[PDB]
Structure formats: structure tokens, C-alpha cells
Design a protein around this ligand. Sequence first.
Ligand SMILES: *[C@@H]1O[C@H](C(=O)O)[C@@H](O)[C@H](O)[C@H]1NC(=O)CCCCCCCCC(C)C
Ligand SMILES: *O[C@H]1O[C@H](CO)[C@@H](O)[C@H](O)[C@@H]1O
Lengths: 79, 7
Amino acid sequence: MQIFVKTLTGKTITLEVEPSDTIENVKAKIQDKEGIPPDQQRLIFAGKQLEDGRTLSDYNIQKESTLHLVLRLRGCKXX
Amino acid sequence: XXXXXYX
Ligand SMILES: *[C@@H]1O[C@H](C(=O)O)[C@@H](O)[C@H](O)[C@H]1NC(=O)CCCCCCCCC(C)C
Ligand SMILES: *O[C@H]1O[C@H](CO)[C@@H](O)[C@H](O)[C@@H]1O
């Protein structure tokens, strides 16, 4: 099925996915298209942040559904 | 370590 991933940068990414795919898969696909490493990706749907490991069907994500992408990297150089 | 960051 088809779903959309939107950012507030004015970008919409179209993806072809299966209801059984995990949020991880989705991030991997996004990496292919946009070059953003999955660890740097946060996906939001229906007021919830989506967890790597759960499936699109778990979250009731269906065709034409729109997930929202936001980027998150905390500084890790130091100690 | 003992000093923070992030750099
Ligand atoms: C400090 O950063 C370490 C790292 O390598 O990222 C972590 O492994 C370690 O757990 C982190 N320490 C804490 O999260 C609690 C730190 C309390 C002291 C710092 C408080 C916030 C301001 C500093 C300068 C970040
Ligand atoms: O952030 C770490 O590297 C820096 C290099 O300039 C140091 O100034 C800092 O004290 C830490 O060692």
C-alpha cells in the first residue's frame, strides 16, 4: 500500500509499504530516499511517536496515511 | 571524562 511521510520543511515522501512492515523498515526506506540515518529519525502518527519494532498495522496505519518526520540527534562527543 | 560537552 501507499503512505506519505511529511516534514515541516515542505517535503512529502511517497512510500510503497506492507501493513506488516515495521517502523524500522520505513526508516530504512526513508534513508534510501533522503540519506537521513534511521537513528536520526522520529516518526509521529495520530499523536504518538512510533517505536522501531512495531508494525504499521499495530498503529492502524493504512493506505494514504500520513506520518510526520522530525529529526533528532543529541550531541554525543564529550564525557 | 568528568567535563561534559557536546563538542
Ligand atoms: C553524560 O554524557 C555521557 C555520554 O557519554 O553521553 C552519558 O553516558 C552520561 O550518562 C551522561 N550523564 C548524565 O546523563 C547525567 C549528567 C549529570 C551531569 C550533567 C548534567 C547536564 C549538563 C552537563 C554539562 C551535560
Ligand atoms: O570536547 C573535548 O575535546 C575538546 C577539543 O578541543 C577539549 O577542549 C575538551 O576539553 C574535551 O576534551
